[PDB]
Amino acid sequence: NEITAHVINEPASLKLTTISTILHNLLKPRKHRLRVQVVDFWPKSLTQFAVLSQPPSSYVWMFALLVRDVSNVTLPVIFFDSDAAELINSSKIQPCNLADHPQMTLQLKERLFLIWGNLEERIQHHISKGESPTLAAEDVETPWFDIYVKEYIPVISLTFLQKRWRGFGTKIV
């Protein structure tokens, strides 16, 4: 599990735990560190990686990476707004209507290639073939990198299904 030179993390004192530990004494906000591989993502079109926040045309980054740890368990990690900008780490790649920006979409693809390798290609391959996108993960080797996540419960009883995780302090280089 040798991490890519292509992903740098912010200076932090958090130590390495596992996704198994995260899921298995109260439910307050937590801050974890993981050594991880991307196994899936949402949404399936990179064209939809930025959404409209404020009309008429103000967009923000919003997507999720399904990540997998040494302990063979997955976690959906949300990259939103400034944290997603941190990851993308590119002046020329900005939130907008991506369908209207083919060149920038290609640039996004190329940048995200550095964190998930041929995952996107394979996911799209399966969609066109009429097969499940989850097949893609086992087709390819995706790179390893350290990731920071902030655990929290947004306002949408109160169970674990109600927790969300958000990536941060992680940049593609």
Partner: peptide
């Protein structure tokens, strides 16, 4: 596990409440 975020995702879910944000910010 079949996670919700792998089918649907909204801006609601991405917003960290101000109180929880403060806890994370201080511990940093």
């Amino acid at each position: 596990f079949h996670w919700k975020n792998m089918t649907s995702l909204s801006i609601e879910e991405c917003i960290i409440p101000k109180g929880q944000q403060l806890i994370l910010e201080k511990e940093s």
